[PDB]
Amino acid sequence: DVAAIPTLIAVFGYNNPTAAAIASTALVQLGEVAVPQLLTQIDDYNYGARAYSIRTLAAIADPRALDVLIDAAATDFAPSVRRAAAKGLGNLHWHKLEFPDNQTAPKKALETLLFISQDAEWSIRYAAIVGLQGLVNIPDLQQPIHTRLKEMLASDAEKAVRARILLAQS
Amino acid sequence: DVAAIPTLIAVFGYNNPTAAAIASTALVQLGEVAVPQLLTQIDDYNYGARAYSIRTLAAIADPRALDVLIDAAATDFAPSVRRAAAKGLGNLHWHKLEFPDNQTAPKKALETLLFISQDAEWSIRYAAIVGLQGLVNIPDLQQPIHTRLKEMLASDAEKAVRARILLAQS
Amino acid sequence: PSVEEFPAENGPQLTPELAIANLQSSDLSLRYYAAWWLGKYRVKESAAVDALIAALEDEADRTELGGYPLRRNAARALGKLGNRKAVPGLINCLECPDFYVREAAAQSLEMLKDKTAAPALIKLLDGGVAQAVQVTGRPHLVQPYEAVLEALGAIGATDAIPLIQPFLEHPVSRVQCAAARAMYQLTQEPVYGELLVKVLAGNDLNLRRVALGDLGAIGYLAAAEAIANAKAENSFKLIALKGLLEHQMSISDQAIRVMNLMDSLL
Amino acid sequence: PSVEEFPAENGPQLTPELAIANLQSSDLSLRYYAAWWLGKYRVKESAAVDALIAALEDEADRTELGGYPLRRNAARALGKLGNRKAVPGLINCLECPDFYVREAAAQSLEMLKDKTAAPALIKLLDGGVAQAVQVTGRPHLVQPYEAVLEALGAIGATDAIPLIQPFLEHPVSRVQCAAARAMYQLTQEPVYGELLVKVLAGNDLNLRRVALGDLGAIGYLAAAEAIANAKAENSFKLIALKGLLEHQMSISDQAIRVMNLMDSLL
Known part of the structure; x- marks a missing residue:
C-alpha cells in the first residue's frame, strides 16, 4: 500500500536492522511510486536511517535518484x-x-x-x-x-x- | 533487578527515546551497582546510544565515571x-x-x-x-x-x- | 584496520586556499566537493565568497533536466558564510531554470536576512496556492514554496502577507508550516505560533524538527514546555530554546525559565 | 544556527606540527587532546612518534587511583601509527601501575605485531585463570587479559599456548573470546574458530562485534556466510570479510565467494 510509504521510511529511524530491512524490502517492492517520498524524506540527522534510504533507492534503481x-x-x-x-x-x-x-x-x-x-x-x-x-x-x-x-x-x-x-x- | 543491567544498556541501541529513557531511569534507580557495567558496555559505534550511557552515568553521579x-x-x-x-x-x-x-x-x-x-x-x-x-x-x-x-x-x-x-x- | 563512526577523512584533505583554488579545477567533482567544503567549514574569507559568487554562473557542470550541480552547492554554501555581498547573485538564482538552484538560493536568502530579495521572492509566489502544484514525475512542487515563504518571513517583507496567508491552506504540510512561520514573523499573532506548536504534537518526526527550528526562529515564548517535551532530538530542542532565550534578552524570570529547560536537555 | 550530526570541529583546530608542540603545553587537557588527535589522524611522521614515546613517561597529568591520562592516550595513539620504534616504551608500560596504561599498551602491541613483547605479555598472565579476578569496586579485572591474550596471538607467541588455553574457561565472556582467537592464531585448529562463530550467534551485540574483528584477524574462511548473516553493522562484517579475503590471497573461487558476500553488504 502506497499510503504506508512515509511510515515505512520512518521505520529506518528505529535502529533495528531486522525491522528496517523489512520496511526497505517493502519499499523496493512498491518500486517507482515510492521514489519521490524516499528522495524527500531522507533523515539528515541519523546516518543509520539514511543508509537505509540510500540502499532502498539504490535497489529500486530509478535514475531520478x-x-x-x-x-x-x-x-x-x-x-x-x-x-x-x-x-x-x-x-x-x-x-x-x-x-x-x-x-x-x-x-x-x-x-x-x-x-x-x-x-x-x-x-x-x-x-x-x-x-x-x-x-x-x-x-x-x-x-x-x-x-x-x-x-x-x-x-x-x-x-x-x-x-x-x-x-x-x- | 541486577541481572537485567546489560539488557537495559542494550536498549539504548534501539533508537526509541521513550524506551531508552525508561531503561535509563531504571539504571539510575539501581544506582552504584550498575556503574561498572555502564562504564564497560559503552556503544562506541552508536552516538545515540552512547549519549544515554553518558547521561545515565552522569545522573547516577558515581565519581568512578x-x-x-x-x-x-x-x-x-x-x-x-x-x-x-x-x-x-x-x-x-x-x-x-x-x-x-x-x-x-x-x-x-x-x-x-x-x-x-x-x-x-x-x-x-x-x-x-x-x-x-x-x-x-x-x-x-x-x-x-x-x-x-x-x-x-x-x-x-x-x-x-x-x-x-x-x-x-x- | 578499524571501524569509525566519524572518519578522519570524507574526501581530499583541503585548506581554504586549496578549496578556493579547486573551484576552478578541470575536475568537476572536485569543484563540487570544494564548494560543499567551504560551506561546511564556514570559510568566510572574502576570496571564498567571491569565488562562490562566480560559481553561481557555472556552465561546466550539468546534470539531469538541465540541472546545475555546482550552482546548487555554491548557492547553499553562500548562505552559511553570512556575507551579503552574495545577495544579488543569489537573487539572480531565483530565476534559474533549475528548481534546486532556486531552492538553494531561497534557503540562503532566508539565512542572510536581506530585504533586497523580497521582490524576487514575491514573484515566485505568482499564481498563489492554486498554481502551487506538483508536475508529474517531479519530486518537488513547481517552486520551492517552503524556502520562499520562510525567506519572506525572515526578511520582514510585510507587504507579502496577503500572498502568504493563503498558503496556510496549501495541501502540503511543510508548506503550511512555513506559511505559519512566516505569518507569525510578519504579524506577531499567537495563533500562528500555536499552529507550530501543534505540528510538534504530530505524528511526523521531520515535521517536528522543522517546527522546532521555526519556533526558535520566531522566539515564541509560550511554546517553551511544549519544545522541551517534544518527541525530537535534544539538539533541535536546544536550538529552539535558544531562539526563545534570545528573544527574552541581565536576567528576567522568563529567561531563567527557558535556561532551566535547556539545562535539563543536556 | 543549525544541527550537525558530524560537526566541522570537536576541539582546537590542529595540524601535525601544532599537535606535536601541544604535547609539551602547560595545559594538560591540550596535551591529552593532542595525543588523541595524533592517533585519530594517524600522523605517522617520525617526530609525532618520538613525542608520543616521550609522553609514555609523563608525570604532569595524574587522575584517580594514581592514573596517568596522557600515558594512556599516548600509548593508544602509538599503536595506530605502525612504528615499531615504540615497542620498547610500550613494553615498559606493561608494568605501569595504572591498569588503563597496561591495557592501552597491550592493545597497541597487538596492533604492532612485534614479537619482542612476548615475555612481558606472558608475565601478565602470572597465576593463570585462578588469579584472573576482579578487585572489589574496580570495573576491570586485575590485568587486561583480553588485550594481552589477543596480543600474544597476534605476535605469534606459540610458547604461550599452555598459558593461554586455560583462559578458554575464564568466567568472563570477553576473555574466553580472546583466548579462542589467540588459540586459533597459534594452533590453526578449527575448533577455536568455531567458538568465535558461535559468539556471532549470541545474544550480545558487543560480543558479536568483537567476534567479527577476531574472525577477520585470523582469516577463518568457513565463517564467511555466518559473518555475512550476523546481527551486526556492515562495517564490522566488511572488516571480517576483508580479513578472510586477504588470507585467500589472481583469483580463486574462495576469494570470489568472499567478494560476492562483501558486494552484498554495500
Missing part, C-alpha cells in the same frame, strides 16, 4: 551511507530518463565514482569499484573505467581492493 | 554525548572517592570543563558553564571558575551563552 546518490557518495561522512550510494550509482536504470539525460546521467555517476575511488578508507574504494563495474553496460564509459582500474591495481595499498579490481577486470 | 566522562567531553565528536558529559562532570559525588582522589577528581573535571568552554559550538560552551556551576560546592576551584566566566561573558559571540553565564554568576 542520481543527484541524491551523488551527494551521499561524495559529501556524506557516514561510510555505510557512502558505500550504499557508490554501489547504487553504477546500477540505476538510465534508459528511464528522457533523452539525452539517459546518456548524461551515467556519465555523471562515473565522474563521482572516479572521484570517490581516491578516498583513503579501503571500504569506500571497494564500493567505488563495484559501482564502476556496474557501468560496463555503457560503451562510452569503458575507457576511463579500464584506465582507472589499472591505475588502482598499480597503486593500491590494500590487497582486498586489488582483488576486487581483478574480479572487476574479468 | 570521571575518566569516561572526560573522554566523552573532550574527544567525542557527537554533541549530544559531549553535552551530557559536560553537565555530568560538575556533579559527581566526589566524596565517595578515597582521599585524596576526592580533591584531585573535581580538579580534573574542572580542567576539562575549562578546556571545552573554548569549543566553537555554542551548545558545548553552554553545557560547559552548567558543569562549571556544579563545581561551586568546592572552595579551591572557585577562582578559576569566576575568572573563566568573566572572560567568557566578555568574549562570547552568543547571547544565549552570556545569559547562562549571568545565571551562573548568580
